[PDB]
Structures are given as C-alpha cells and as structure tokens.
Amino acid sequence: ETLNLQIPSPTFEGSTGGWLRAAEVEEKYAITWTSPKEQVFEMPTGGAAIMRQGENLLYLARKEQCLALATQVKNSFKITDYKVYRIFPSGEVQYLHPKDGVFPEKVNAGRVGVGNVSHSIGKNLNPAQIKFTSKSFNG
Amino acid sequence: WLRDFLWAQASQVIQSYGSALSAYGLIFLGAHFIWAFSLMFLFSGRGYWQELIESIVWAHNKLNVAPAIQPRALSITQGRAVGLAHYLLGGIGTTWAFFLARIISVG
Amino acid sequence: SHSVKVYDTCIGCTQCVRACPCDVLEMVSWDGCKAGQIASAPRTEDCIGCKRCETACPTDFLSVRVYLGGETTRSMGLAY
Amino acid sequence: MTAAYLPSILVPIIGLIFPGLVMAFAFIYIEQDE
Amino acid sequence: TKFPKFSQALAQDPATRRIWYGLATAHDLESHDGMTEENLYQKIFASHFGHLAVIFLWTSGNLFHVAWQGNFEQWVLNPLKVKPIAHAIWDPHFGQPAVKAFTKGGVSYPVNIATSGVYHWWYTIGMRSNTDLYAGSLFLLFLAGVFLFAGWLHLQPKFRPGLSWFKNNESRLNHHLSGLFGFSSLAWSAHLIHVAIPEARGQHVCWDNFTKVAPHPAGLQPFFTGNWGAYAASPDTTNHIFGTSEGAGTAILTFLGGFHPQTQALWLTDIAHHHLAIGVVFIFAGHMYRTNWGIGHSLKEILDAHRPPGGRLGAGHKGIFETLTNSLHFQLGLALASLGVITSLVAQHMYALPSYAFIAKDYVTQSALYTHHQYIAGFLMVGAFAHGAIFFVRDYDPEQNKNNVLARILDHKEAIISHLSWVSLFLGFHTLGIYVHNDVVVAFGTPEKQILVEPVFAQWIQASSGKALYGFDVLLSSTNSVAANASSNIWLPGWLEAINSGKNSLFLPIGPGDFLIHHAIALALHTTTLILVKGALDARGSKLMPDKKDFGYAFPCDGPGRGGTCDISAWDAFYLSMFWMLNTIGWVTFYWHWKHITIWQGNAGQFNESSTYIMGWLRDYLWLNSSPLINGYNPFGMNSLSVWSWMFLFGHLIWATGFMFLISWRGYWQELIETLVWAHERTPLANLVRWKDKPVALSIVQARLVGLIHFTAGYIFTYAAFVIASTTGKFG
Amino acid sequence: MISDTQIFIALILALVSLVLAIRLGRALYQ
Amino acid sequence: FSPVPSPEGTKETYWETKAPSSDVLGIGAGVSSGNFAAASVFAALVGGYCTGQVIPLTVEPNPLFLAGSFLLPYSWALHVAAWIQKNNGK
Amino acid sequence: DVAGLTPCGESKEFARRLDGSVKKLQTRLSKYEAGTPPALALQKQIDKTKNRFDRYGKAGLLCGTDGLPHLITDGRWTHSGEFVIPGLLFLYVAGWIGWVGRSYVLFARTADKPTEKEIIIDVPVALSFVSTGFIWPFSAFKEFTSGNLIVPADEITVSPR
Ligand code: CLA
Ligand code: CLA
Ligand code: CLA
Ligand code: CLA
Ligand code: CLA
Ligand SMILES: CC1=CCCC(C)(C)[C@H]1/C=C/C(C)=C/C=C/C(C)=C/C=C/C=C(C)/C=C/C=C(C)/C=C/C1=C(C)CCCC1(C)C
Ligand SMILES: CC1=CCCC(C)(C)[C@H]1/C=C/C(C)=C/C=C/C(C)=C/C=C/C=C(C)/C=C/C=C(C)/C=C/C1=C(C)CCCC1(C)C
Ligand SMILES: CC1=C(C/C=C(\C)CCC[C@H](C)CCC[C@H](C)CCCC(C)C)C(=O)c2ccccc2C1=O
C-alpha cells in the first residue's frame, strides 16, 4: 500500500512553477500512476513532461495540483491507476485518493455520511433564535 | 500639468458655446458623462442588479406584462466589458473634443 | 475550514462529486431518493471553497451548500 | 510664543519617536504566538 | 498567532489576512468568541465613557492651542479685520519662503487660519481673554479624566450594571429628557442670562463675582411675582456695540426676532429665552414615563394599543417593544437616522439664522461649517440604514413579530423597491433631460428656448413667511391677515426687516436654477435611499440567494453559479450607496457654495444665468474658481494657499488610487504575489529574511472597503481644499 | 498671555488623563 | 433575548374588538362616557374661548387665559375617551 | 405679473436678447456678397431668429430679470399650455405605447414559441395592436374593473421574506 519512494519520475526539464520552502517544512503531495506508453503530458505547474512506460511518481505542493493532473490523465490517456498521497516532513505518508479503493462518485459500503442535514435548506433556523446560544442553525 | 496644460487649454472648449465649435463643447460634456456612467458598471457587481431586476419583474408581474424573454442582469464578463467600453469612449472622447477645439481656435 | 452541508433534497446525480477539484465529496447509500444514494462531505479540511459543487447541483435550491469559514493553508490554495 | 522651545522638542518626538515605538511594539505583539 | 484574541478563526489564519481582519472586526463585540449579552452591554458602556473622554480632550486641545498660540485677544478687539489663528506651525521641511508666507495673523510665526468658527462661538458665549480659554481647557481636561475613571470604575465587579438596568427604558427616557435635554438647556439659559449677555454689554461676570452681580436690576423678584414681562423691558438698542456698554439695554428674556444689526446674528436674549422655554418643555416631557411611584406611562402598553381598528396595519405595533429593547442595531439605526436629520437641520439653520457675533461676514467659516455638517449628515444617514440591514439579518425574529408593521414591510418590500425605482427614473430622466435640453439650446446660440421653470411653490412658502419679493401677498406678507396681525406685537416687526433685507441668507431668492438643482437633489436622495432600502429589505433573502441570512451581513459573493452573484450581500448595498451619498452631498454643497459666492460678490445674476445648463456649472463654478487654488504655488513663487493647493492634488491622487481597488479584482493580484514569493525565496542574501505571515492578496470585501476608503478620502480632501482656498483667495 | 508654568499645569493634568486612559483601555482589553 | 422589563402594573392592551378595553384610559378607566362627552364639549368651548381671547399675543398676557387655552387639545383626547367608553358600555 | 415676472412682450431684456442675437448674425453676414449661398443662409437665420422672438413676445410667456421666458406650472389655467396641455398630450401617447405593448405581450404568451414572437415580431398582428391604442383610457379602465389588469398577490412569485 505504502508509497514506494524509489519509483522513477516522469522526465522533466524543470521549471519555476514547482514547490517551494513550505513543501519541505509543512507538507508535500505525491501522485503515482501506471502508463502503457512513454508519452507527453502537461504538468499542472508549468510546461510539458514525458511520462515513462510503467510506473510514474510526482511531487506537488497542493492536493488540487495532484487531482488536476489525475483528471487530465484519465480523460487524455484513459489512466485511472492513480494514487494520491500526503507526505509530512516527519516522513509519515498519508494515503489520500481514492480514499477507500473506490472513487468518490461510485458508492461503497462502509461509507458513513458526513454533513447530511435532515431537512431542506429553507428549514434552517433564523440567526436571532440562535444568538448568544451555541445551538447550530441547521435545525 | 494640471494648471498650465489642462486648465489653461480647456478655455477654448468651455467657452465654445454659441460658436461653430459648440459641437466640441457639447461632446466634451457628453464624453465626461459617458466616462462617469462607465464607473457604474465597473464598481458594481451583478448580484445587486439581478436582485433589483427581481422587484421590477414583480411590478411587471402585477400588471400581467412580464416578458417571455426573462430579464437578466448582464454577465460578470459583460459587465466588465460594458464598463471598459464606456470608459474608453468617454476618456478618449473628452480628449478628442479638448484637443480639437483647442487647436482649431489657436492653430 | 469551510463547512459543507448536504440537504435531503439531493437526488443522487453525483454531479457535485465529479465537479469537486479537491475530493471533498463522495457518495453514500440512502433510501430517501430514487437514485438510492446521497452526497456526503467527509473531507472538508481539504475544501478550498471554489463552490463548483454548488454550480453542478440541479435541485432548485442547492442540496449542497458551502459555507465559507476559517481560512487555512489548504483552504487558501497556497503552494507556498 | 511662550515656552517656544516646546514645538521643537515635542514635534520630532510625537512625529517620529512615538510612531517608531508603537510600530515596533505593535509588530512584536501581533507576531507572538503566546 | 494571538493578535485577534477575540477570534480563534482569525488567530489561526497563517496569512497577512489575520492582521487586516483582526483590526477591522475589533469593535464588533457581538461576533467575538464567547460573548454573552451581559458582557456585551458592559463593554459598550465603558467604551462610551472612553468616547466621551476623547470628545472632551479634543475640545480642551482646541481651547489650549488657541489660548497658547492664537490671537484671540487681538481678534476680540477687531473681529471683522483680524483673521483667527488655529495653531502654530513647526515643520522642519519648510523653506524660508514658506515660513514667511504663513506668517499671517499679526504674529511672528507661521500659523493656520481657523475655519472652525470657534473664535466667534467663544466670543459670543462670553470668553474675552486668553486666560479664560485656558481655564476652560483645564476644566475639560479634568472632565475627560473623570469620564475615563468612570469608565474604568463601571467595569469593576461591584460596579458592573446588570442587564435589567441597561434595559430600563422608562427611567432612562425620563432622565434623558428632563435632565440631559431639559435641565441642561435650562442651565445654558442660566449661563447666557448670568454671563454671556452681561459680557455682551461690557460687564465682566466670572466665578469671582457672579454671586454679587444681578443679571437683572430688579432681580428674581419679578419671576416670583408673575411679572415675567418685566424681564423683556428695555432690550438692546439697534445702536448697541457688542461687547460694550453703548446702546445696551437691561432685558434678559426677549422675543424681538431677527438679527442684532451690528453682529448680524440672533439676539442673545432671544437665545436665552429659547433655552428657557426648551428647558421647561423638555422637563415636562421627562415626566411621561412610569419609574417607581405609580404615575406615568408604560411604553409597552402604548405600543400595544396603537393598532388602527380598520386593520390596515395588521397587528400594529404589538411585539415591537420587545424587538427594539433586545436589538441594539435597531436602536443604532433609530439614533443615527435621528442624528442625521438634526445635523442636516444644523447645516441649514445655521447659515440662514446665524447665532454667533460677527459670523456670516466670515465667508470661509460659513462655507466650511455648512460643508462639514452636511457631510457628517450624509454619513449618519447611510449608517442608520446600514444598521437597519444588520438588524434584519442579525436581530430580527419573524415569530415574535407576526403581522407587525415590520413583518408587513417585508411582505410588500417588492412594492416599495419597485416604486422607489420608478420615482428615481421619473426624476432622473426628466431632470437630466431638461438640463441636457438647455445645454444644447444654449450651445446652439439660443438660450431663449431653454426650459426654465419658476419654483413657485417654494416662492409661495417664502412669501407665507413674509418675503415681499415675488408679489404673492399671502399670510405674513399680507399686511391685513390673521397670521400677520397675531404676531404684530412680537416677532413680526423684527422678522420682516430680517427677511426683507437682501443682505443676509434668510430665505435666499430663488429662480429656475434653484428648481433644477432641487430636483437633482431629490433624485439623489431617492436613489441613495433605493440602494439602502433594497439592501435592508433583501438582506434576509432574495431569489438569487434565498438563504442570505445564514451567511451574515458582509460576505464576498455566492460564487459564479446561477449567473453570477458579485455584490449580493447587504453590506454591498451599503458599499454601493456610499458613492450615491457622496454624489448627493456633492450636488448639495456645490449648490450652496456657488449660490453663496455669487451673492457675496454682488453677482447673483451669474448663478441665475449659468446654473440652468451644465456648462455654466463647469466653467463658472469649477473652472473659474479653481484659479486662486491652483496658483498657490507655481514657477514664480508661493503663498499661504500653497497647502490647500497641495491637498487638492493629494485629494486627486487618493481618489484615483481607489479606482485600482474597485476596478481590478483579487485573482490577478494573487498571481502577482505568487511570483514575488518565488522571487524572494530564490534571491540570495534576501532569502535569509523570512515572513512570519504568508503574503496574500487582499480579500474581495476588504478590497471593496479599501477602495471605498480611498475614494471617499480623495473626495473629502479635494473638496475641502477647493471650498477653503477658493473662498479665501476670492474673499466673496 | 499664558505662562510656561500654566502650560506645565496643563501637561500634568494631561499626563494624569493618559494614565487613566491606559487603565480604562486595559480594563476594556481585559 | 433576555427578559425585557416593564413597570409594575403593565397589563395587556392589545385589542381587536370595536373599541379598546377601558384599561387604555389609565386613571380614567372608571369615568362614564357621558362624563367624558360633557367634559370634552366643556373643555373645547373654554379652551377655544381662552385661546380666542389671546390670539393677539402681547408682552403682558392674562396667565389664566394661557392655561385655559390648553383645554382645546385636551378635549380631543377627551372625546376619544368618550367614544371608547360609550362603546364599552360605560 | 406672476411671481414678480414680466411679460416677454414688454421686458426690455428680451428685446436686448433679440438685438444681440441679430447683431451676431449681421456681423457674420458683413463678410459675404449678396447673392452668395452663405449670405442667403445667414439672412434666412436672421428672419428665423426675428420670427421666434416675435412669436414668444405675443404668446403670453413671462420673461425673468434675465429676459429669458419662464414657465409657470402650478396649475393655473392662463399657463396651461406650458405644462398641463403638453402633459396631457404626453400621457395619451405614453399610455398608448404601454397599452399596445401590453396587448402584444399577452398575445405572444399564447403563441407556439412565446419567445420567438418577441425577437421576430408578427408585424400584421403587432400593427393590429398599434392601431388599437387610440382608446386606451377606456380599454384599460374596463380591463381594470373586469379583473383583468391586476393579478392577485398569490399568482406572483416573491422572495422568501
Ligand atoms: C485632541 C487633541 C489635540 C490635538 C489634535 C493636538 C494637535 C497638536 N498639538 Mg497638542 N495639546 C493638546 C491637544 C491636542 N493637540 C492638549 C490638551 C495639550 C495640553 C497638555 C496640548 C499641548 C501641546 C504642546 C505643548 C504642543 C502641542 C503640539 C501640537 C501639534 C503637533 C503634534 C504634537 O507635537 O503633539 C504633541 C501633543 C502633546 C504632547 C499633548 C498630548 C496630546 C493629547 C492630549 C492626546 C490626544 C489623544 C487623542 C485623543 C487620541 C489619539 C489616538 C488616535 C490614534 C485615535 C498639533 C497641532 C505642538 C505644537 O504646537 O507644534 C507647533 C507642541 O509643542 N500640543
Ligand atoms: C512626522 C514628522 C516628521 C519630522 C519632524 C521629520 C523631520 C525631518 N525630516 Mg522628514 N519625513 C517624514 C516625517 C517627519 N520628518 C515623513 C512622514 C516622510 C516620508 C514622506 C519624511 C521624509 C523625509 C525625507 C525624504 C527627508 C526628511 C528630512 C528631514 C529632516 C529635516 C531636514 C534637515 O534639517 O536635515 C537635518 C537632518 C539631520 C541632520 C538628520 C536627522 C537624523 C535623526 C535626528 C536621527 C534620529 C535617530 C532615529 C530617529 C532613531 C529613532 C528610532 C525610532 C524609535 C524612531 C528632519 C530630521 C531630510 C533628512 O533626512 O535630512 C537629512 C530628508 O532628506 N524627511
Ligand atoms: C454619470 C454617471 C451615472 C449615471 C447617469 C447613473 C445613472 C443611473 N444610476 Mg448609477 N452609478 C454610478 C454612476 C452613474 N449612474 C456610479 C459611479 C455608481 C457607483 C458604483 C452607481 C451606482 C448605482 C446603483 C447602485 C444604482 C444606480 C442607479 C442609477 C439610475 C438612477 C437614476 C435614475 O433612476 O434615472 C436616470 C436615468 C438615466 C440617467 C439614463 C440616461 C438616459 C439614456 C442616456 C438614454 C439615451 C439613449 C441613447 C439614444 C443611447 C445611445 C446609444 C448609442 C449606441 C446609439 C440611473 C440608471 C440605480 C437604479 O438602477 O435605479 C433604478 C441603482 O440602484 N447607480
Ligand atoms: C416624483 C416627482 C417629484 C419630486 C420628488 C419632486 C420634488 C420636489 N419638487 Mg417638484 N415637480 C414635479 C415632480 C416632483 N417634484 C412635477 C411633475 C412638477 C410639475 C412640473 C413639479 C413642479 C415643482 C415646482 C413648481 C416646485 C417643485 C419643488 C420641489 C421640491 C419641494 C417639494 C414639492 O413642491 O413637491 C412638488 C410635488 C409635486 C408637484 C407632486 C408630484 C407627484 C406626481 C406623482 C408627479 C407626477 C405628476 C404628473 C406627471 C402630472 C400629471 C399630468 C398633468 C400634466 C395633467 C422637491 C425637490 C419646489 C421647489 O422647492 O423648487 C425649488 C417648487 O417650487 N416642483
Ligand atoms: C411595452 C412594454 C412595457 C410595459 C407596459 C412596461 C410597464 C412598466 N414598466 Mg417596464 N420595461 C420595458 C417594457 C415595458 N414596461 C422594457 C422593454 C424595459 C427594458 C428597458 C423595461 C424596464 C423597466 C424598468 C427598469 C422599470 C420599468 C417599470 C415599469 C412600470 C412603470 C412605468 C415605467 O416606469 O416605465 C419605464 C419604462 C422603461 C424603463 C422602458 C420602456 C422602454 C420602451 C419605451 C417600452 C417598450 C416598448 C416595446 C418594445 C413595445 C413594443 C410593442 C409592439 C410589439 C406592438 C410599468 C409596470 C418601472 C417599475 O417597476 O415601476 C414600478 C421600472 O423601474 N420597466
Ligand atoms: C482610542 C483609545 C484606545 C483604547 C480605548 C480608549 C482607552 C477608550 C481610547 C482612549 C484613548 C485616550 C483617551 C488617549 C488619551 C491620551 C492622552 C491624554 C495622552 C496624553 C499624553 C500627555 C503626555 C505624555 C504629557 C506628559 C507631560 C509630562 C511628562 C510633563 C511632566 C512635567 C513637566 C515638564 C512640568 C511639571 C513637572 C513634570 C511632571 C516633571
Ligand atoms: C432600514 C431600516 C430597517 C428597519 C429598522 C430601521 C433602522 C428603523 C430602518 C431605518 C430606517 C431609516 C434610516 C429611516 C429614516 C427615516 C427618516 C429620515 C425619516 C424622516 C422623517 C422626517 C419627517 C417626518 C419630517 C417631518 C416634517 C414636517 C411634518 C414639517 C411640517 C411643517 C412644519 C410643522 C413647519 C413648516 C410647515 C410644515 C411643512 C407644515
Ligand atoms: C446597470 C448595471 C446592470 C444592469 C444593466 C442592464 C440590465 C442593461 C439593460 C439596458 C437596456 C435593457 C439596453 C441598453 C440599450 C441602451 C439604449 C444603449 C444600447 C447600446 C447598444 C448595446 C445598443 C448589470 O447587469 C451589471 C452587471 C455587472 C456589473 C455592473 C452592472 C451594472 O452596472
């Protein structure tokens, strides 16, 4: 499951759009995927890179940069074998996406609903009733 | 620049009424107007104008005269484009009237 | 973080989940609608507040509602 | 003017030292974790 | 990480946004973390003591700097010829031409000439020397300290008032009407009778002798006999020289009407009798409400009983008492609306009926005071509507207000907004149409084709008060009318002289230019009201954002969906109406100032002929009067109007800088700031220095506020420089 | 005219007002 | 949001009937409608007479005529109280 | 006369307006020969200026101190041709335009594609409507009393509050 750090990266000539000091002191994100070919893609941070046949690995500063590349590869090259990780400066690696092996738009058992409100949006509480009270406006 | 260029040389445009250069005198004011009118589109946002249009639509609904092409406030991009077009028209038009009345009178 | 709510008018069209750029939303099972599924927001710490989910939703007033709240490095979209 | 030395004493202090001191101490106060 | 101590959401922001938002939300105590209502009302009480102390320190400072550096004693000898000094200048950036150029006032040092009118005010109320100005400054310094101490004391645990005290409306109303309004009006009548009027008649009265010097020769015996009319006998003659004994009478309570002929100001005995009568009426007003002894009215009962039986107002005012007492924003909106109307009355009634001796001959002071109080009025009037919007969002409860006047307002809000939209368009189309018509017709050489409407309704109102200029012969103008005959014994002889001399600003003559500008002012008032009312009534919800109340008062937008929702918050309607308030006060003060400077030359016909088209306003007001201002420095030298000449340009700069925040928006600036963050991290010798807070672009709402502040500041500074320098340079 | 000693009396009372202003501000700040 | 205090003796004054309850008259709750109607007519005539006697106001007026002129606005409130009591059966 | 104004036929400043306006044209005419097109044009302007001033003098207009005609709009019948009668003419035309446009919008609602009728106008039907507007006060008032002008409050969409 865990990120094999030794995976070769896509060939790239470098750019100024990559990650900065906050990546090595706050968090960095990684994306891995399998390619059937040695083909050109566009980096979220800049110009063009070439993905190597087999397994690829990138490091990006934002999670959204990892997911923007993931949508681009899925539509352009029909690759869905992408895994997104969060990596902390302690060395600890956090698997992120897809979170339980199944993509979020496909249903899965054992997913518990978070954020679900039992009434429609117009049935919320007016601000005055919950003033100087800790009670939430969602009913 | 304020005194010896704009103020001193705007004498011919602002004193032009009743002459053949009174057209430049009118276009000077008209472009000053259009320029100011552009800032209504540049400083405002679409959501205010859509909610104002809702109350005007209500008054048309009351008299059974609502249109079948439902009125909308202009898009965010079109609001920017209308503001920029009227800004450019008013600023350039004011310079055009000032330059032409000044140099026709003195040159 | 931002706070994202899903109200029970959700028809289970999955459009918000496909539109979300930061994997905040996912689909869970629910017998309330014809599609048998409702959106859920388990990962709101990653919500940047783009409101692309709200644009995607087709119910009359949005079943998904994003409430912009406290700002973080994640919700500010800062790569520095 | 009576006590005419006072503007030449107080105006540099009020106009330079007083803002330099409040900027320095406000900067320290707003950037402390505790 | 701990500056916004009142907000844990801001104190954990890692950007520069934390500093900005923590400073801008500091006084909104209702939103601070862990705020109860008890603690909210006690902090408001103490910070009201701190504000009162700030006002007393400002007044003591003005008195001190005039006592120390001014020429009050030289001005008091010859008030029409000497120019009052505000304070001295010590600026080490000055050159010797600047030091010499500002050395006016009859003194040996550079000085600012005061436009505040405080010399005329302190002279009229009794002050004659520098030492009693200094005594007054030390008294206000002491009072400022006393109110600072009172604020600190009422935050101490035994002296913290309870919520039941803060919401005892009946007692507060009784004490504020009979003591704060009524008794202090009666005491100010006492000051005028005992000090100001004797010193207007040459006799010094101070704390050293005021118990042995009677204000009246008879002396408090006619009052205790019912012979009150003995205090009106022998008023000041029309030959009275203010400050001296020549021509002086002995009356202390008169109703002469009109102006003192030499000071061109209202009689001091009229002002003293005014404050006596106001004091008695307000003290009577302050016995209306029941406190502890069983007489008086319950406010709750009066509001509950005023439901018209025809049912046109629904449930009437039932439940309004609870909402007003609980809501501080409703209280703020009522107080600010009420205060805004008064400061507009202050501006209108002090130029037409001046009370200070030798004022109205100082044109710069009259222009500055009118402009100042009309701008304060426009700000107060905007704030009243802003806090009414905050009331509806935050404090309004629809279940305690079922079928009220408030709920029925929200039930026909669309009708009010649509009608306001109609009246604004009806005024705007035709006022702009008549102005543009006149412009084209004058430009084509044919001014006799102009549409010139005579303002007959206002001229008829002037004639009803006795103006004999339009031949209307109605009421007071008619010599044999019930109105004229009723007041023939008292006010009518003096008032008729005042209103029918063409040498003051009491009921100024009007024509077609006054008609057109009054209609423009009406359009501006309706449009500013439309944005503020639409903002208050759509604050809770609309069709674009029906759940707008869940998001608050100030939020950026709801995003690009549903067509786009920029500027959808109620705060954004405050923002949009601020431009229209500035436009409205602009049209009002431009009108006042042009009409007054043309009258002050003796060339009222220049306003009469040029005000009916817009080129007359452009060349004969802005362009013509700009020339002394923009020549304050030039390549040939400088004079004392150089500072206003600089402030004028300063005002043009800030205003234009505001455009940058209002036209260009966040996404552009955030991408620039990201290229600068990269450059700092990659530059050697500079990347040794690191930010504690991540540099980000300003927020959407913050940038709207920053652009509004820059716009407004540029507006104020530019107009202040023009109105002071043009009046000073012209002197007329 | 005003003597310098009178100016010094004004500065003493304004200093007392500054001390009371700090104490009120600290009470308000908590 | 917290209990709003009102003075002791505050009662319910909301009415949806033809006339308000007699409690809206305060201390005049027990006066009959005939007595308000006659007092209203009396106060209107005396107030109008005293007002008429001092319409040319002078520096020395009769003080009693001044005080008696205040009966004209007071008579308006008196006839409103007469209508309230007559429609309450008093 | 009214409001201290002077009838334009005897105000001397109106006479100076006419004289200065004609001298301004005559000094331009002094630079041209008799039968030339600029001379003919300026003489036509001089005649037009004189005609306008003469007509205004005999019309009952009231000039001010400036000598420019002023309009009285308080409602008196001696001055009804300056605001009240032009206003009656305006309200007839404006009510015509409103009645005719409302009639076309109600026709277009009953069409196959209602929004195609408003960008591509049915010109014979729209001309049928433009002709009907001459009796708009009676048609619109009968429309009102028959309960067909005003719609009830519960068939109108409103905001939540
Ligand atoms: C609100 C009141 C006020 C204001 C705006 C001013 C303004 C000024 N004073 Mg000051 N002054 C005041 C009250 C005030 N005075 C009082 C009450 C005294 C008597 C103790 C003095 C005594 C005084 C002296 C002795 C001198 C000045 C001078 C000056 C000038 C230069 C600034 C300076 O050196 O400050 C110095 C001012 C002080 C040391 C006095 C303390 C200032 C007050 C009491 C504090 C006010 C705080 C305010 C309410 C809130 C500020 C916070 C703000 C961010 C909201 C400037 C015109 C100088 C001058 O004449 O230069 C030409 C100078 O030498 N002043
Ligand atoms: C608010 C009041 C204020 C006051 C009293 C002064 C005072 C002065 N400025 Mg000005 N200045 C100000 C605001 C002020 N500045 C602002 C807001 C700006 C930005 C627009 C400027 C920009 C400015 C420029 C660009 C220049 C001055 C100069 C000067 C000096 C006058 C010229 C002279 O005689 O040279 C004699 C001056 C000296 C011999 C040098 C004085 C050095 C001081 C006394 C050392 C003090 C140590 C330092 C303050 C430690 C403080 C730490 C912190 C707590 C403040 C004088 C020191 C000129 C200057 O620097 O002169 C060299 C100059 O070139 N000023
Ligand atoms: C000179 C500048 C200017 C002008 C004319 C206007 C005009 C108007 N504003 Mg705007 N506004 C401005 C600046 C300006 N604003 C600025 C800077 C702000 C701050 C952001 C605002 C903010 C603002 C708000 C927030 C609101 C307004 C409203 C209004 C209306 C109020 C007056 C009225 O109802 O009837 C006056 C009508 C007119 C002046 C229209 C002019 C008639 C035209 C020019 C006809 C000419 C047709 C011509 C043949 C076309 C030629 C086209 C060519 C291609 C052939 C009106 C449309 C309010 C509104 O919409 O009320 C309903 C409203 O809610 N304005
Ligand atoms: C909604 C429109 C509107 C508004 C806000 C105002 C506002 C004002 N007018 Mg203006 N006025 C208007 C319409 C309006 N007027 C019209 C249509 C006329 C007739 C030409 C006038 C004629 C007029 C005169 C002569 C004077 C004012 C003056 C004033 C000021 C004082 C108040 C007053 O006299 O009210 C006037 C209010 C009305 C006349 C009520 C108008 C209400 C209706 C709905 C407007 C439409 C009527 C309609 C088109 C006419 C019907 C048809 C008829 C021709 C047969 C104030 C600025 C006075 C002033 O101080 O000038 C300096 C003044 O002397 N007005
Ligand atoms: C013929 C159609 C028609 C009718 C009957 C009305 C009727 C009304 N409008 Mg609406 N309106 C229309 C078209 C129409 N409008 C159009 C095309 C626009 C877009 C410019 C608007 C924009 C508009 C606004 C912004 C406002 C109104 C308002 C009003 C009301 C008061 C009168 C007024 O203010 O006029 C104002 C008229 C205009 C601003 C524009 C009219 C433009 C032309 C002259 C009319 C349309 C001609 C149309 C093409 C007819 C073709 C007929 C043919 C097919 C046979 C009234 C309910 C006001 C309101 O709600 O008051 C309560 C208001 O504030 N209207
Ligand atoms: C906005 C604000 C913020 C927070 C909330 C708030 C508190 C309510 C509010 C209030 C702010 C307020 C009210 C601020 C008030 C600020 C004030 C009143 C500041 C006064 C300063 C006076 C000084 C430094 C004079 C010192 C004189 C000296 C040392 C002379 C001494 C001497 C001389 C030479 C001669 C005599 C002998 C000696 C003694 C030797
Ligand atoms: C937004 C909002 C939401 C809900 C809460 C909220 C805060 C309450 C609200 C704010 C509302 C606001 C901000 C409301 C602002 C309301 C204002 C400014 C109301 C102005 C009222 C002025 C009046 C009635 C003048 C009357 C003069 C008269 C009768 C003179 C008469 C005359 C006399 C005697 C002498 C001359 C002759 C004549 C002419 C005969
Ligand atoms: C006034 C205004 C509107 C409302 C403006 C509208 C609805 C335009 C409607 C005007 C009429 C309907 C057409 C205008 C025709 C004119 C006579 C000129 C025509 C110019 C050519 C297009 C023909 C917005 O939608 C808006 C959106 C975003 C930022 C600012 C604003 C803004 O300021």
From TrEMBL, chain A:
Q: Is Chloroplast among the key words of this record?
A: yes
UniProt entry keywords in alphabetical sequence: Chloroplast, Photosynthesis, Photosystem I, Plastid, Thylakoid
Gene Ontology CC, one term: photosystem I reaction center
Q: In which compartments does the protein localize?
A: Plastid, Chloroplast thylakoid membrane
Q: According to its UniProt record, where is this protein mainly located? A: plastid
Q: Which GO terms describe its biological process?
A: photosynthesis
What is its membrane topology?
A: Peripheral membrane protein
- Tell me, in a sentence or two, what this protein's role is: PsaD can form complexes with ferredoxin and ferredoxin-oxidoreductase in photosystem I (PS I) reaction center.
- From which organism does this entry originate? Rhodomonas salina
Q: Which InterPro entries match?
A: PsaD, PsaD_sf
Establish whether keyword Thylakoid is in the entry.
Answer: yes
Q: Which family does it belong to?
A: Belongs to the PsaD family.
Protein known as = Photosystem I reaction center subunit II
Automatic annotation (TrEMBL), chain B:
Phylogenetic classification of the source organism? Eukaryota, Cryptophyceae, Pyrenomonadales, Pyrenomonadaceae, Rhodomonas
Annotated chlorophyll a 7 binding sites? 96
The annotated subunit structure for this chain is: The PsaA/B heterodimer binds the P700 chlorophyll special pair and subsequent electron acceptors. PSI consists of a core antenna complex that captures photons, and an electron transfer chain that converts photonic excitation into a charge separation. The eukaryotic PSI reaction center is composed of at least 11 subunits.
Residues reported to bind chlorophyll a 35: 32, 87, 95
Q: Where does chlorophyll a 38 bind?
A: 78, 86
Chain ranges passing through the membrane: 21-43, 84-104
Q: Where in the cell is it found?
A: Membrane; Plastid, Chloroplast thylakoid membrane
Binding residues annotated for chlorophyll a', in chain numbering = 32
Where does this protein hold chlorophyll a 36?
40, 48
Q: Which organism is it from?
A: Rhodomonas salina (Pyrenomonas salina)
- Binding positions for chlorophyll a A3? 40, 48
Which residues does UniProt call coiled coil? none
Query: What residues does phylloquinone bind to?
Result: 49
The entry marks the following residues as binding chlorophyll a 37, namely: 60
Query: What does this protein's UniProt record list under function?
Result: PsaA and PsaB bind P700, the primary electron donor of photosystem I (PSI), as well as the electron acceptors A0, A1 and FX. PSI is a plastocyanin/cytochrome c6-ferredoxin oxidoreductase, converting photonic excitation into a charge separation, which transfers an electron from the donor P700 chlorophyll pair to the spectroscopically characterized acceptors A0, A1, FX, FA and FB in turn. Oxidized P700 is reduced on the lumenal side of the thylakoid membrane by plastocyanin or cytochrome c6.
Q: What is the recorded name of this protein?
A: Photosystem I P700 chlorophyll a apoprotein A1
Q: What family does the Swiss-Prot or TrEMBL record give for this protein?
A: Belongs to the PsaA/PsaB family.
From TrEMBL, chain D:
Q: Which residues cross the membrane?
A: 6-30
> Topology relative to the membrane, per the entry?
Single-pass membrane protein
Q: Where in the cell is it found?
A: Plastid thylakoid membrane; Plastid, Chloroplast thylakoid membrane
Per UniProt, the keywords (alphabetical) are: Chloroplast, Membrane, Photosynthesis, Photosystem I, Plastid, Thylakoid, Transmembrane, Transmembrane helix
Looking up InterPro entries in the UniProt record yields: PSI_PsaI, PSI_PsaI_sf
| BP term (GO), one | photosynthesis
What Gene Ontology cellular component terms go with this record? chloroplast thylakoid membrane; photosystem I
User: According to the lineage, what is the superkingdom?
Assistant: Eukaryota
Family to which the UniProt record says this protein belongs: Belongs to the PsaI family.
The task this protein performs is described as: May help in the organization of the PsaL subunit.
NCBIfam families, from UniProt?
A: PS_I_psaI
Q: What is this protein called?
A: Photosystem I reaction center subunit VIII
Query: What is the source species?
Result: Rhodomonas salina
Tell me the organism's taxonomic lineage.
Eukaryota, Cryptophyceae, Pyrenomonadales, Pyrenomonadaceae, Rhodomonas
| The encoding gene | psaI
Automatic annotation (TrEMBL), chain F:
- Cellular component GO terms held in the UniProt record: chloroplast thylakoid membrane; photosystem I
UniProt keyword Transmembrane, yes or no: yes
The record's comment on protein family reads:
Belongs to the PsaM family.
Q: Which UniProt keywords apply?
A: Chloroplast, Membrane, Photosynthesis, Photosystem I, Plastid, Thylakoid, Transmembrane, Transmembrane helix
Provide the taxonomic classification: Eukaryota, Cryptophyceae, Pyrenomonadales, Pyrenomonadaceae, Rhodomonas
The residues that cross the membrane are 6-25
Q: Respond yes or no to whether keyword Plastid is given for this record.
A: yes
What is the protein named? Photosystem I reaction center subunit XII
Q: Which GO terms describe its biological process?
A: photosynthesis
Membrane association type: Single-pass membrane protein
Q: Which SUPFAM superfamilies does the record cross-reference, listed alphabetically?
A: Subunit XII of photosystem I reaction centre, PsaM (SSF81548)
- Compartments where located: Plastid, Chloroplast thylakoid membrane
What Pfam families does the record point to? PsaM
